[PDB]
Amino acid sequence: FAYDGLKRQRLTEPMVRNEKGLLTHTTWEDALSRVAGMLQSFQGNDVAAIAGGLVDAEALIALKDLLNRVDSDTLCTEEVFPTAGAGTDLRSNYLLNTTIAGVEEADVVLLVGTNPRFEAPLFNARIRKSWLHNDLKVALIGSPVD
Amino acid sequence: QLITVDEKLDITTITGVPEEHIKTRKARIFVPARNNMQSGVNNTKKWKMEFDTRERWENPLMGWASTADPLSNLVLTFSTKEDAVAFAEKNGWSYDVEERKVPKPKSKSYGANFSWNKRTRVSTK
Amino acid sequence: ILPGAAYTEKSATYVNTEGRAQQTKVAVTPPGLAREDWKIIRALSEIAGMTLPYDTLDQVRNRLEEVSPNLVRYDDVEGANYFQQASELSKLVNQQLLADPLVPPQLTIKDFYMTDSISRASQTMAKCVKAVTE
Amino acid sequence: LHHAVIPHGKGGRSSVSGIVATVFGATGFLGRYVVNHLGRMGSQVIVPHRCEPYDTMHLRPMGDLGQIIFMDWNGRDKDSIRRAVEHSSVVINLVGREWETQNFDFEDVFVKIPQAIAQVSKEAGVEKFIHISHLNADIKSSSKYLRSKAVGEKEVRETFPEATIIKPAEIFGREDRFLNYFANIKTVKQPVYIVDVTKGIINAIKDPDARGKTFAFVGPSRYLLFDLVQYVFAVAHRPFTTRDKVERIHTTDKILPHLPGLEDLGVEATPLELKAIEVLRRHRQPAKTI
Amino acid sequence: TSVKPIFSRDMNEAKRRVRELYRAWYREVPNTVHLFQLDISVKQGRDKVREMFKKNAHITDPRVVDLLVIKGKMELEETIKVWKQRTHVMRFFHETEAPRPKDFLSKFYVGHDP
Amino acid sequence: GVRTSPTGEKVTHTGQVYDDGDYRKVRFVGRQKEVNENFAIDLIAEQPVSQVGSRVISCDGGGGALGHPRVYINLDKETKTGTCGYCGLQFRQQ
Amino acid sequence: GLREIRIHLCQRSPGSQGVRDFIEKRYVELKKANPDLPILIRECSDVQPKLWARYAFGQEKNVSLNNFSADQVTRALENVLSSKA
Amino acid sequence: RPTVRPRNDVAHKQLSAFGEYVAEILPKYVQQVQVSCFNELEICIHPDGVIPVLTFLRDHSNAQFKSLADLTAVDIPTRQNRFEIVYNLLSLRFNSRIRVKTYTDELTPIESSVPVYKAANWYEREIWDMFGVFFANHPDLRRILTDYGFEGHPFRKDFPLSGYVELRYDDEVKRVVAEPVELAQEFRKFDLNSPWEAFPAYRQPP
Numbered sequence A: 001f002a003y004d005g006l007k008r009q010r011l012t013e014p015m016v017r018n019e020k021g022l023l024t025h026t027t028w029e030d031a032l033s034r035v036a037g038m039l040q041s042f043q044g045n046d047v048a049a050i051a052g053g054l055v056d057a058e059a060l061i062a063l064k065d066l067l068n069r070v071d072s073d074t075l076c077t078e079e080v081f082p083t084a085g086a087g088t089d090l091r092s093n094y095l096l097n098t099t100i101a102g103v104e105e106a107d108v109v110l111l112v113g114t115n116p117r118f119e120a121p122l123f124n125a126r127i128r129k130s131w132l133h134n135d136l137k138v139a140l141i142g143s144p145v146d
Numbered sequence B: 001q002l003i004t005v006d007e008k009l010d011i012t013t014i015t016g017v018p019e020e021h022i023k024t025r026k027a028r029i030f031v032p033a034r035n036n037m038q039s040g041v042n043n044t045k046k047w048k049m050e051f052d053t054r055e056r057w058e059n060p061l062m063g064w065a066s067t068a069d070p071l072s073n074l075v076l077t078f079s080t081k082e083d084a085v086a087f088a089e090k091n092g093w094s095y096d097v098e099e100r101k102v103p104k105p106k107s108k109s110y111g112a113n114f115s116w117n118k119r120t121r122v123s124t125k
Numbered sequence C: 001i002l003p004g005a006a007y008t009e010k011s012a013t014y015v016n017t018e019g020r021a022q023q024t025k026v027a028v029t030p031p032g033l034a035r036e037d038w039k040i041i042r043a044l045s046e047i048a049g050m051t052l053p054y055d056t057l058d059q060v061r062n063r064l065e066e067v068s069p070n071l072v073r074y075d076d077v078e079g080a081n082y083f084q085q086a087s088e089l090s091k092l093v094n095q096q097l098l099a100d101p102l103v104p105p106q107l108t109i110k111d112f113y114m115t116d117s118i119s120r121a122s123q124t125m126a127k128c129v130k131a132v133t134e
Numbered sequence D: 001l002h003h004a005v006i007p008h009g010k011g012g013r014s015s016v017s018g019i020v021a022t023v024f025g026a027t028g029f030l031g032r033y034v035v036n037h038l039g040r041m042g043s044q045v046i047v048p049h050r051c052e053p054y055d056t057m058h059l060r061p062m063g064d065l066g067q068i069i070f071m072d073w074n075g076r077d078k079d080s081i082r083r084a085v086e087h088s089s090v091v092i093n094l095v096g097r098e099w100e101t102q103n104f105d106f107e108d109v110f111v112k113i114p115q116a117i118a119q120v121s122k123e124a125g126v127e128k129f130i131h132i133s134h135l136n137a138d139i140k141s142s143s144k145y146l147r148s149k150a151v152g153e154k155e156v157r158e159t160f161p162e163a164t165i166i167k168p169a170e171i172f173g174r175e176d177r178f179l180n181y182f183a184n185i186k187t188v189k190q191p192v193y194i195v196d197v198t199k200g201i202i203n204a205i206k207d208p209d210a211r212g213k214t215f216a217f218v219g220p221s222r223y224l225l226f227d228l229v230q231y232v233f234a235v236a237h238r239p240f241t242t243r244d245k246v247e248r249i250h251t252t253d254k255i256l257p258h259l260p261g262l263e264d265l266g267v268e269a270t271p272l273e274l275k276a277i278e279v280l281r282r283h284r285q286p287a288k289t290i
Numbered sequence E: 001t002s003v004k005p006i007f008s009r010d011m012n013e014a015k016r017r018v019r020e021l022y023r024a025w026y027r028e029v030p031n032t033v034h035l036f037q038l039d040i041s042v043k044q045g046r047d048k049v050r051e052m053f054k055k056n057a058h059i060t061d062p063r064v065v066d067l068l069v070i071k072g073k074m075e076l077e078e079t080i081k082v083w084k085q086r087t088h089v090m091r092f093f094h095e096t097e098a099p100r101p102k103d104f105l106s107k108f109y110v111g112h113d114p
Numbered sequence F: 001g002v003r004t005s006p007t008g009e010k011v012t013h014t015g016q017v018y019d020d021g022d023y024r025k026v027r028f029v030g031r032q033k034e035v036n037e038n039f040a041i042d043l044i045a046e047q048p049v050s051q052v053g054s055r056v057i058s059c060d061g062g063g064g065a066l067g068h069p070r071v072y073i074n075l076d077k078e079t080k081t082g083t084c085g086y087c088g089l090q091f092r093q094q
Numbered sequence G: 001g002l003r004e005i006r007i008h009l010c011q012r013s014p015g016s017q018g019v020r021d022f023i024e025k026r027y028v029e030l031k032k033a034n035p036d037l038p039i040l041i042r043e044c045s046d047v048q049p050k051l052w053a054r055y056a057f058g059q060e061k062n063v064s065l066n067n068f069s070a071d072q073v074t075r076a077l078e079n080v081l082s083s084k085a
Numbered sequence H: 001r002p003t004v005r006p007r008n009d010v011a012h013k014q015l016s017a018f019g020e021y022v023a024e025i026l027p028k029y030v031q032q033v034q035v036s037c038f039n040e041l042e043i044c045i046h047p048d049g050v051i052p053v054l055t056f057l058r059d060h061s062n063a064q065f066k067s068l069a070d071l072t073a074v075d076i077p078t079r080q081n082r083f084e085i086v087y088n089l090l091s092l093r094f095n096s097r098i099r100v101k102t103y104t105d106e107l108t109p110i111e112s113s114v115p116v117y118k119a120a121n122w123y124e125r126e127i128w129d130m131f132g133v134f135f136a137n138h139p140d141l142r143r144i145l146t147d148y149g150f151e152g153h154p155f156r157k158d159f160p161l162s163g164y165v166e167l168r169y170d171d172e173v174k175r176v177v178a179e180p181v182e183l184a185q186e187f188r189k190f191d192l193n194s195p196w197e198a199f200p201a202y203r204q205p206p
């Protein structure tokens, strides 16, 4: 039901700040020239990027490639994952390695610091299904959510 | 009398399609998903081939949806994905094939509704 | 501000919590002057004299394969190994647990409906929030 | 940009170019090409006309349904001008006449009317204004036609400072009064092709650097009027008109190196040799260029 | 890989028919420009003929080449016999079509198409 | 229920009106915006609620086979009236 | 100089066996020596093993590791870690 | 039963017997013979058999199919040979109709049947025009229905309904011109098929 947000508060034109400090519609040519001018004038740690939650991989690599070309490696995300130890070197460090369908084969599930009902509703539904049909035993460490 | 021909079948030069609608299109080969609003499975029997969606814009006069994509409505039907791939190959379209998704067989038991000691017992009928 | 495309307006690759790569398809084109997000960056790279080496969706997806090959294996779940090596490195540096209890950001249904920019702009989601609080 | 005028489509008849143009003088030689190019890419064209609607009929097929709108107007009535321009994003003034009538002198057509259109357009908030003057416009000309062009060109610049002013040489084309003029019969001429001028006008609308500038539109070659007329007769396979027109025809085409031209708008001038047959085929050795 | 031929049994046989068609088209352009009173030059017409032939230079299937020749001869017959009108001959030249953008940046500015 | 926008254009019963900066209103210059003045939402509201004695009433819109498909309306709720989904007539159990 | 290491390999193909041996035996010690260097290990079924090195300003080279032994893998790692291309 | 079309077993039996008769006499070419529940006999043949089979049916004393009612094609993209060539014949002597079907692809010529039926002349031109099937030894094979210089074969299932180009008069060049098709209102595709099987008798094995 959230799709109706796609019809509201949309960004439809390039915008740059005018002489008075307000965002004003402009052409693609003008908007990118202003961005390209600043990009050419900076290098290394002076350029950084943050990716939001809804960004696609094609854009993620394109931005990483573009910032790498000015020797910037500060490609960040908003969601934190500890970089201590292996960090992101090993996929298994940050994956749901059992897979969603693998919950139906588990016999005990330990949930730590999560409310999967709202974080991953269809994953929680898979837990309940195993709870209902496989007699799965579930334990939680965290707030006693429903 | 027959002749030998080893070249891959290619008809892009004799189909009359403009170059733009051969090289820049992306054909999708798939079995349509069941419409979740209905239980009937008869629209999931055959393979389909559709093309990438392009721009539709509002007609200034009436507000109708205008298009410049001649392939916007084209949808072909195929017995198998091999037939669809063969058709895409000889027409020069690049394509993606998605494997058919079949519902996995379930274990159903009415008696489980009244289990003596399991959670499958239903609280209402 | 550079207007990009929403997930319904582009064919883009997303990887779910299991590492399974999947791709959206274009349902409608982006509104107004908005553009496909990777194309914006590719266009910016050229104007900046640093043209990126890909010009089509298929070419930028060839690039993804060079960085992480699993990112183009659509619908496939590629296994990941070496938990033993990760646990060794995890023990190298000691860090203390804070005394704070583990408290998830979403404790009730009211916290569920608005979490991103799309659902925050949704009038239906606002009606849901209002209904479950009032 | 208002959402209604964001470009959409592939530049065809059913597309939305985002241009809303009021073209004064659209029922003449130049206007029919300008309207055609605007309507080709799906622009909204407002056509104020003084003539009978029967005389505007050739403009109707030039746009998709609803894209050509016709209005009554009077050159001396500023209210009729305001109705025509108050919804437009660009105003193109192609009003002109090669002779004077009982009711309109060169001063009316080339000074009072352009000034009125420019002033109302400025009041109504029109962003762009394109005014056609003449290459040989000169306060010190024998032609009262060219004298009035110079006075009007000055007035438009004062009234609408951001106006794009275009100064073409004599224009040749199917409906011209130039090649057709000779065929129906010391000085150097640099005639320019009708389609080149049209492309220049259309590109001056899109080009944001064109605002405030004055352009001279000339063909690629300069000819002696004697060489031209001889060539015209040869192409027409023929054995080789006010007094003001004669003065104009005998005015050497000015060489204004300081003004930008067709090349500055991305248009390549068409040689007279390629298109001369097109104009003159119905009246049935290239001329030496300087 | 054993198929029925159309006219030619191999590429050398097919390439002969292509050359014969090219000569026929080459010699017809001057009369076409005169009969249809076209404003293009004879060189333009022949340059257009060559361009049409050259975009098919990569074909190596004799059956496909045979059909291209078959279709090319139908087009020639339509022209020599003045079944075509002037509009049909000039459709090869796309005079009213404005030049579409080819480079990435130009395409990016105008729309969404690849 | 026709009202005029600040610029003078009549608003339709679907709420349509060209805004101040829309060029498209040039189409009405020298002509007119066709607007139907009999707003159905206003006209149906004037119809009186019909008082009935049963829990369930039926409506076919009037005129027998010239009306709409016959539907049955439950009138158990006392807070509100029963409304026909086809013609908008209202009913209330006395 | 060096900015990022990536190692691609298959989980089961014999051609990636040497890379698999290197990871299980030598990666942990490699990571300790280069604590602040991204070494992205990415397994994918049926891919030929590869070693990608990225240097400053987005220059990349890739060395094939197919059928390499764990020792050759070590050697290739040392070559990249001493370069500044 | 008032609403049900009555069966005609006598005609079904006669047509079946003649179908076997034809199959016995031209085994070299006949691949399949079937009679429909509304009593229409179809002979499916290898494409090499077009001239021998049609000649036999026209001239043989127990056939005498002297009239070619229709000749047409059907495009079925899922088939390796996508074009089905259908001959509908009529025998005035025996007051009977028969249908002969063969197949071809985009690059395989079919022998022209003009020698057997002069009526085939324009039908084959129409098939070439609308489907692109080439008929060999036709006296005059060329487009018949489409505009001069028209590219493609519109009746193929993959040819778009509105085509690729459209025409208008252009004032600048003073002639009708062709340009890529843009539609003010796109044709609205409807998905009408019910997800529930209608006809069990035609269910395909899974």
Ligand SMILES: NC(=O)C1=CN([C@@H]2O[C@H](COP(=O)(O)OP(=O)(O)OC[C@H]3O[C@@H](n4cnc5c(N)ncnc54)[C@H](OP(=O)(O)O)[C@@H]3O)[C@@H](O)[C@H]2O)C=CC1
Pocket: D024, D025, D026, D027, D028, D029, D030, D031, D049, D050, D051, D074, D075, D093, D094, D095, D096, D097, D098, D104, D109, D132, D133, D134, D135, D167, D168, D169, D170, D171, D172, D177, D178
């Ligand atoms: N053609 C040339 O060789 C050159 C022309 N120019 C200028 O370019 C512009 C157009 O050229 P061209 O197209 O040849 O001009 P035309 O004379 O061919 O058409 C002139 C237009 O102005 C309109 N017009 C004339 N007088 C009046 C009036 N008194 N009140 C209202 N409308 C009027 C006419 O409408 P109606 O049909 O109703 O009279 C017609 O649409 C003119 O300004 C001309 O001076 C400049 C350089 C060269």
Ligand SMILES: [Zn+2]
Pocket: F059, F060, F061, F068, F084, F085, F086, F087, F088, F089
């Ligand atoms: Zn009712």
